[PDB]
Design an enzyme around this catalytic site. Structure first.
Site, PDB file in Angstrom:
ATOM      1  CG  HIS A   7      -1.449   0.982  -8.606  1.00 27.41           C
ATOM      2  ND1 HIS A   7      -0.733  -0.257  -8.663  1.00 27.41           N
ATOM      3  CD2 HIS A   7      -0.770   2.089  -8.996  1.00 27.41           C
ATOM      4  CE1 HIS A   7       0.525  -0.019  -8.871  1.00 27.41           C
ATOM      5  NE2 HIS A   7       0.649   1.391  -9.087  1.00 27.41           N
ATOM      6  CB  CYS A  57      -1.108  -0.090   0.929  1.00 29.81           C
ATOM      7  SG  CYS A  57      -2.081  -1.435   1.127  1.00 29.81           S
TER       8      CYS A  57
END
Ligand SMILES: [Zn+2]
Ligand SMILES: [Zn+2]
Lengths: 350, 350
Positions: A278, A22
């Site tokens: 993303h 992340c």
């Protein structure tokens, strides 16, 4: 036909794919692109120390000629061995873990006050009785500016970071049913309660509360409301295209109209679903005033339109490809304090 | 001169001291005092199963004559061995862990839909274009009603649960800078986005967002704004003293003016600092319409003033002894669905 190179004339180096890490890569690069931070990172097996792994990764990012770097040893130094480690932690928790380890190692050196000299601002939360006028204040410190995008029950979301910051210092009115028990008045009276900022950090971090956690899912959710933010942020009152190159002159005009002027250099953004998505960031090299997109193994030139899209905006529905920014990093504009990246040819050893 | 006894004529049993367990005891008792839940809890070593430990504790709480009971085996069945386990988890996470284990064991029985028949409500979040009128809706489920007390930037905090619930279903207006990309209009248009409730749960849980987590501390913080909530909650429009005994008649009047009427029976409250404090709850026995204060090893009669104080209110400062409620449990009033506690003399074995 050109290629992104560092102040040293060396190609920018990326990181490995964000295999459930992340914000990790976007956070590492944003810290690596902070001049004071990277400059301070230079001077049994203690391989588990967060500072040593951060120092090894920074030196590699500055000298290596490869394209991508591994982050397995850094996440090992954090102790976050679980696959869902970064899914269950906010980025602010990771920033605190890294800063706590650096402060703990720098204790007694010439960097023991470095973390709080750079990232710590001071405010005070007060309760002011509206009858007698007496106040009860207590001084607080902060490493983040937690600004909401769309508060609970709000009809309009904040259109800009400035508008959310203004509401952040908005005094709450304690009247009607929840009056304030004043000790000087010895009774319940109308009052004002809230925050007021006395000193902004030298390195200003702004958290945009797009990410919330739904407990009924129970996954992360994200607001997509459009919120703007400039490259030159004027925060004098607290004591639209900014993506292109900065005015050296208008900043001086704002300096003539107040001293707290800040320069944007990191825009950490997220795309896709919040249950994952993303992560990447737009970071600017402050020495050369050039914007670049740091996206895993790929560091490329960033255009003003690419960064301006990170303001957000509601798409057609739950399609739902959309990129918006959740964190911003500013640096105060002080031609005396502002440091440049020391060149790689100044390093003593390798 | 009387003593608190159960419908069976048996003295109420308390729990051990909240040695950093926080909401645990208040949650266990609130579930134990739910008629449908306790009634459903009856019908290698699987001692690690959450259902079996909850069943053993419920049977002991109903039949034992002691004063306090241990919760070491229950927190062991959760897997929360750490001392700071309950400090790092919200109560909603513990409710989900217990309900997931019960659903996983009840799969294929006559209780496989029990959890969602009792605690699950249905809503839908929509985006309605204001030009063409077309909507994009998606149906959501919820086990909680997460109501804020004082939203970000708010000048006034919500004076009641009803006011926060009204703002919870308030449509956000998407105009100006963050318009909505309508697919039917093929362009950006003003729109409405928000929630609307289609079916409230049979067992309504309301989370009052007093507890927030400051990342700069980094400890828990709590709002002390006064917010009221009644014993008879009228939620017809979504499809001040309520502490004393319920009207059997006014409830019928509200039933003649709508079908969604709810009866308060649990008020989980907290006192002291948020970095810890003292947790307990006011729970009402629905069969006898009697309020009791469940505070660790001590279950006593609760007075209307004691419960009414849990509405909150800002004290003199950071003294700062103050008790306010963070969670509420209501049960829908249906003289056909509403079940009573089955008597202890109906149990088959021990
Ligand atoms: Zn006063
Ligand atoms: Zn339309």
């Amino acid at each position: 036909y050109a290629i992104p190179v560092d102040e040293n004339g060396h190609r920018y180096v990326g990181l490995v794919n964000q295999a459930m890490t992340c914000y990790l890569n976007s956070l590492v690069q944003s810290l690596y692109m902070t001049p004071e931070f990277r400059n301070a990172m230079y001077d049994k097996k203690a391989e588990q120390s967060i500072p040593c792994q951060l120092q090894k990764l920074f030196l590699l990012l500055q000298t290596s000629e490869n394209d991508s770097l591994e982050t397995k040893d850094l996440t090992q130094s954090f102790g976050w061995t679980s696959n869902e480690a970064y899914d269950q932690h906010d980025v602010q928790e990771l920033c605190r873990l890294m800063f706590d380890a650096l402060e703990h190692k720098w204790k007694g050196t010439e960097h023991e006050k470095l973390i709080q000299d750079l990232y710590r601002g001071t405010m005070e939360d007060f309760v002011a009785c509206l009858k007698c006028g007496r106040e009860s204040v207590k001084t607080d410190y902060f490493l983040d500016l937690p600004l909401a995008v769309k508060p609970f029950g709000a009809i309009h979301a904040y259109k800009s970071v400035e508008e959310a910051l203004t509401a952040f210092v908005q005094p709450e009115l304690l009247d009607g049913s929840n009056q304030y028990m004043c000790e000087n008045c010895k009774s319940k009276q109308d009052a004002h309660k809230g925050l007021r900022i006395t000193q902004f950090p030298y390195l200003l971090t702004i958290q945009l509360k797009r990410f919330d956690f739904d407990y009924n899912t129970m996954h992360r959710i994200k607001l997509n409301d459009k919120m703007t933010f400039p490259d030159v942020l004027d925060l004098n009152d607290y004591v639209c295209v900014g993506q292109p190159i900065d005015h050296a002159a208008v900043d001086d005009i704002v300096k003539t109209s107040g001293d707290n002027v800040y320069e944007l250099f990191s825009v950490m953004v997220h795309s896709g679903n919040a249950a994952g998505g993303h992560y990447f960031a737009y970071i600017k090299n402050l020495d050369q005033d050039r914007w670049y997109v740091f996206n895993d193994t790929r560091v490329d030139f960033a255009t003003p339109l690419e960064i301006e899209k990170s303001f957000g905006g509601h798409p057609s529905g739950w399609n739902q490809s959309n990129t918006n920014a959740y964190m911003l990093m500013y640096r105060r504009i002080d031609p005396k304090r502002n440091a440049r990246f020391i060149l790689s040819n100044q390093l003593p050893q390798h």
